Amino acid sequence: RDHRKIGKQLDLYHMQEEAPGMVFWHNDGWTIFRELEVFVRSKLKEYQYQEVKGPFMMDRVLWEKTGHWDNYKDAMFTTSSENREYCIKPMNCPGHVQIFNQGLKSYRDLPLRMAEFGSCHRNEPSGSLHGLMRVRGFTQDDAHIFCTEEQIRDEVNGCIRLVYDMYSTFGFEKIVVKLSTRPEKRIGSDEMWDRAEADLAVALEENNIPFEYQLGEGAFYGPKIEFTLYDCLDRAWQCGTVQLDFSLPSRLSASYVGEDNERKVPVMIHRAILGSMERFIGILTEEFAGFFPTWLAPVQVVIMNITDSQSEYVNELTQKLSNAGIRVKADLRNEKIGFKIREHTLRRVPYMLVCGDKEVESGKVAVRTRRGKDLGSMDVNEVIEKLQQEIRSRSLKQLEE
Amino acid sequence: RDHRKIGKQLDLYHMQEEAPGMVFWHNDGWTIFRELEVFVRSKLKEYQYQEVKGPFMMDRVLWEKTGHWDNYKDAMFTTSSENREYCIKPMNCPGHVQIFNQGLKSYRDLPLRMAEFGSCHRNEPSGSLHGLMRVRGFTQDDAHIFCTEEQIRDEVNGCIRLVYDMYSTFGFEKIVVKLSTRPEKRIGSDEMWDRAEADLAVALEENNIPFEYQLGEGAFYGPKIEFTLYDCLDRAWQCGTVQLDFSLPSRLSASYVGEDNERKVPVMIHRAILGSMERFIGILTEEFAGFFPTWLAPVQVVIMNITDSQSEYVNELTQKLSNAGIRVKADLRNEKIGFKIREHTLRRVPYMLVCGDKEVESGKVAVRTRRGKDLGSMDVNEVIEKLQQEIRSRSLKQLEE
Ligand SMILES: C[C@@H](O)[C@H](N)C(=O)NS(=O)(=O)OC[C@H]1O[C@@H](n2cnc3c(N)ncnc32)[C@H](O)[C@@H]1O
Numbered sequence: 001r002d003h004r005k006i007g008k009q010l011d012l013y014h015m016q017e018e019a020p021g022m023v024f025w026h027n028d029g030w031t032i033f034r035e036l037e038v039f040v041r042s043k044l045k046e047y048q049y050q051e052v053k054g055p056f057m058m059d060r061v062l063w064e065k066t067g068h069w070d071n072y073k074d075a076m077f078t079t080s081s082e083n084r085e086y087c088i089k090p091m092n093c094p095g096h097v098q099i100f101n102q103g104l105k106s107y108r109d110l111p112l113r114m115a116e117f118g119s120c121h122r123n124e125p126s127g128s129l130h131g132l133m134r135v136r137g138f139t140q141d142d143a144h145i146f147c148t149e150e151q152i153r154d155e156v157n158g159c160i161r162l163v164y165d166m167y168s169t170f171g172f173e174k175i176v177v178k179l180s181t182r183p184e185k186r187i188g189s190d191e192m193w194d195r196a197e198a199d200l201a202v203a204l205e206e207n208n209i210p211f212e213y214q215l216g217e218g219a220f221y222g223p224k225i226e227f228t229l230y231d232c233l234d235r236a237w238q239c240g241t242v243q244l245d246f247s248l249p250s251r252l253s254a255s256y257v258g259e260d261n262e263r264k265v266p267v268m269i270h271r272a273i274l275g276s277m278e279r280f281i282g283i284l285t286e287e288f289a290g291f292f293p294t295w296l297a298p299v300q301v302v303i304m305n306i307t308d309s310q311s312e313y314v315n316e317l318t319q320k321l322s323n324a325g326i327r328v329k330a331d332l333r334n335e336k337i338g339f340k341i342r343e344h345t346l347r348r349v350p351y352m353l354v355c356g357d358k359e360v361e362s363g364k365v366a367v368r369t370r371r372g373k374d375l376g377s378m379d380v381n382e383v384i385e386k387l388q389q390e391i392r393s394r395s396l397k398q399l400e401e
Numbered sequence: 402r403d404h405r406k407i408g409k410q411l412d413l414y415h416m417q418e419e420a421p422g423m424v425f426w427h428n429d430g431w432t433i434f435r436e437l438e439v440f441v442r443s444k445l446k447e448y449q450y451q452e453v454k455g456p457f458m459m460d461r462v463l464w465e466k467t468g469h470w471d472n473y474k475d476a477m478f479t480t481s482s483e484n485r486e487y488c489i490k491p492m493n494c495p496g497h498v499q500i501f502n503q504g505l506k507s508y509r510d511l512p513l514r515m516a517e518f519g520s521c522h523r524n525e526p527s528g529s530l531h532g533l534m535r536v537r538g539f540t541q542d543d544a545h546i547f548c549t550e551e552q553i554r555d556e557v558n559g560c561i562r563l564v565y566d567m568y569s570t571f572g573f574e575k576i577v578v579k580l581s582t583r584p585e586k587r588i589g590s591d592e593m594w595d596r597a598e599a600d601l602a603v604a605l606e607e608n609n610i611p612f613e614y615q616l617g618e619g620a621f622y623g624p625k626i627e628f629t630l631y632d633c634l635d636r637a638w639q640c641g642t643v644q645l646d647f648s649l650p651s652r653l654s655a656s657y658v659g660e661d662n663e664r665k666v667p668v669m670i671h672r673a674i675l676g677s678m679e680r681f682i683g684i685l686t687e688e689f690a691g692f693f694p695t696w697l698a699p700v701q702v703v704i705m706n707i708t709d710s711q712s713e714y715v716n717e718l719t720q721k722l723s724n725a726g727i728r729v730k731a732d733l734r735n736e737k738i739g740f741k742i743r744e745h746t747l748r749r750v751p752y753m754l755v756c757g758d759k760e761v762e763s764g765k766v767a768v769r770t771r772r773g774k775d776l777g778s779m780d781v782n783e784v785i786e787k788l789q790q791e792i793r794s795r796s797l798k799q800l801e802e
């Protein structure tokens with residue numbers, strides 16, 4: 001169930017030697033990506049996350065202040081303009097702090113949850129690249145929560161709930177979790193690390209989450225919980241993650257007015273639920289073997305004619321399903337119906353509607369599924385409602401299965 | 402009237418020295434950006450376009466092949482990795498051709514309209530930067546149409562119609578059209594330029610569009626129709642653009658199987674309707690002086706109490722409007738109602754619902770607008786239906802105005 005082969009077969013994306021680890025999302029792959037963004041946005045609205053967009057690059061001075069220049073230099077791409085040096089962002093956190101720093105903040109504004117579908121670039125060693133799982137340019141479903149020390153428990157709990165809730169939609173209910181502790185190269189005192197590692201360990205146990213400690217694998221700025229999903233070859237991939245940061249806000253001069261009217265430095269929780277769109281889509285492609293649930297399917301329905309005689313009927317139904325919000329395409333090619341059906345079956349199109357003369361003068365449609373099931377003759381409005389229901393509920397199963 | 406001042410007043414975005422010409426989109430500005438994307442996508446669907454996403458950078462060798470290295474060198478940011486040089490993309494076209502090049506193409510696949518909200522970076526001289534109008538990082542509502550020479554007329558006409566179609570939503574009264582011809586530094590033969598310039602002029606005449614020439618300002622790869630919009634100081638800004646390219650496809654080895662079964666090179670039409678999201682938002686901000694039509698307004702409705710006595714009611718109404726899909730916020734502060742109305746008017750919030758004891762008992766709301774108008778008491782569901790209609794129709798006007 002190699003996602004790279006499936007990606008080619010379903011025309012989802014491609015990569016080239018001229019852009020190692022740089023993904024070209026084709027129309028169908030991009031549709032999946034966009035549906036995942038819609039899903040993430042829907043889930044975050046529930047938590048009142050703001051959504052922002054930060055700059056693609058920032059001055060070297062900024063990255064020196066955060067600690068990235070000294071602890072993350074090899075992974076960063078650099079460029080220049082007018083003798084000024086810039087780093088293309090490998091993370092979205094610094095930009096989020098810059099936004100937080102605009103306008104006086106008070107304890108009343110916390111917790112402040114700031115999300116971004118942030119494009120990150122990291123100069124990963126070429127030999128470590130692997131399909132969509134490890135690339136050089138990727139988009140994270142990122143967010144940073146600015147809060148008080150007393151709010152850490154609840155905010156970390158909120159991130160954890162988000163992970164399990166969102167993962168359950170895809171059928172993932174068996175997650176291997178790691179707590180990666182202080183790395184050799186790091187910022188912050190040992191006292192700070194003791195406190196942060198403890199906070200995360202307690203959060204995991206309070207949630208009855210079995211986890212394994214992982215020596216020296218934390219971020220340079222804080223310990224991290226890793227939510228692990230496996231690929232077809234049983235290789236572990238870090239997808240969701242939660243990190244506790246007591247260093248970056250101070251380094252970037254972030255503060256707020258406490259209730260005691262004194263200036264305080266907020267705590268920052270970093271988290272990505274899916275991880276990156278690229279990696280998560282890679283995992284989903286292998287998990288479903290290309291049979292994406294209807295809500296995620298690039299093309300949900302294909303309508304085919306037998307001969308040019310049903311073309312008009314097919315075009316009418318196509319526009320009708322399209323107006324109903326279904327991703328539909330008409331296949332009016334001069335090919336045998338069995339040839340068309342095989343093609344769309346291989347493309348994993350959830351539903352196929354066949355229209356012969358009988359369907360045209362009946363006003364109905366013959367329905368088939370990509371699993372080869374013959375659903376017989378159905379009413380057009382009936383198929384539309386059933387599809388809309390399957391889509392709205394983001395169901396893992398198709399009609400009658 | 403200046404978008405930079407209005408942007409600050411509405412907390413839409415900010416810029417700073419560590420990222421010259423790079424926008425930090427705050428929640429409210431990003432909301433506008435996202436609504437424009439939804440709008441464009443609605444039109445892309447209607448006009449039959451695929452939507453893709455290309456990589457942020459590619460090998461400098463590819464940019465040499467396209468002619469960008471010799472004709473667009475100063476504008477490109479460069480970076481490197483493992484002994485190889487890369488250019489951060491200043492345009493989305495080469496990436497689209499790489500996608501087109503994947504999989505054998507037939508004349509039956511044309512015209513192939515490929516759109517992308519493409520993030521471009523150009524090393525614009527710092528002295529030339531201006532708010533959101535001229536930045537170094539921006540997102541184009543770009544697309545490239547691959548077609549046959551016989552399809553040029555219909556495809557260019559389609560782009561022109563799309564421009565006026567989309568622009569009518571905003572009610573622009575001043576749109577100056579320019580036909581920018583062959584520049585000093587260019588690729589392609591003089592005969593090719595003669596044909597391309599003539600094709601664009603004929604398209605403009607066929608659509609009854611008066612225009613003026615702009616000698617020597619075409620792209621290095623082809624002539625351009627420019628749809629010019631103006632800011633509050635009546636300064637001209639190129640927004641929409643349609644360009645005809647007979648050079649890039651060949652340079653990047655693009656081809657398709659013709660009807661005669663012979664290999665043919667497709668013509669490529671480049672076009673952006675809004676231009677860049679950044680520049681377009683700058684223009685809209687000045688055009689409306691911050692009074693964004695309700696569908697674009699960051700916050701569409703603010704519900705306010707008088708005393709904490711109506712807080713529960715206000716919270717219930719805010720949840721109800723939120724569930725109805727309206728961008729609503731509650732203002733429960735212990736501030737004079739006159740001050741609250743003043744503040745949200747400064748923020749250009751379309752509608753303000755005032756809730757005193759009478760409203761709580763009646764189950765209604767007192768409606769006011771940012772234009773200072775009193776719409777009186779209204780039923781909550783009535784307000785919801787009217788706002789949803791104003792939003793769905795992307796109407797330029799508010800209730801009773
Ligand atoms: C969570 C963020 O706020 C934090 N700054 C951060 O970047 N954490 S991270 O470095 O662990 O990255 C977050 C997620 O991005 C994904 N990711 C990281 N590197 C890559 C890569 N090279 N290719 C694909 N996905 C990646 C992983 O799923 C990872 O869990």
Ligand SMILES: C[C@@H](O)[C@H](N)C(=O)NS(=O)(=O)OC[C@H]1O[C@@H](n2cnc3c(N)ncnc32)[C@H](O)[C@@H]1O
Pocket residue numbers: 491492493494523525533534535536537539541543544639640641642671672673675676677679680
């Ligand atoms: C239309 C594209 O396919 C074509 N390759 C292209 O890039 N044309 S362009 O160079 O004229 O740019 C398209 C639009 O982007 C916008 N744009 C260009 N440069 C900037 C900039 N520095 N800041 C903001 N918007 C810009 C303008 O509205 C312009 O009309």
Ligand SMILES: [Zn+2]
Pocket residue numbers: 091092093144270271
């Ligand atoms: Zn982070």
Ligand SMILES: [Zn+2]
Pocket residue numbers: 492493494545671672
């Ligand atoms: Zn182009």
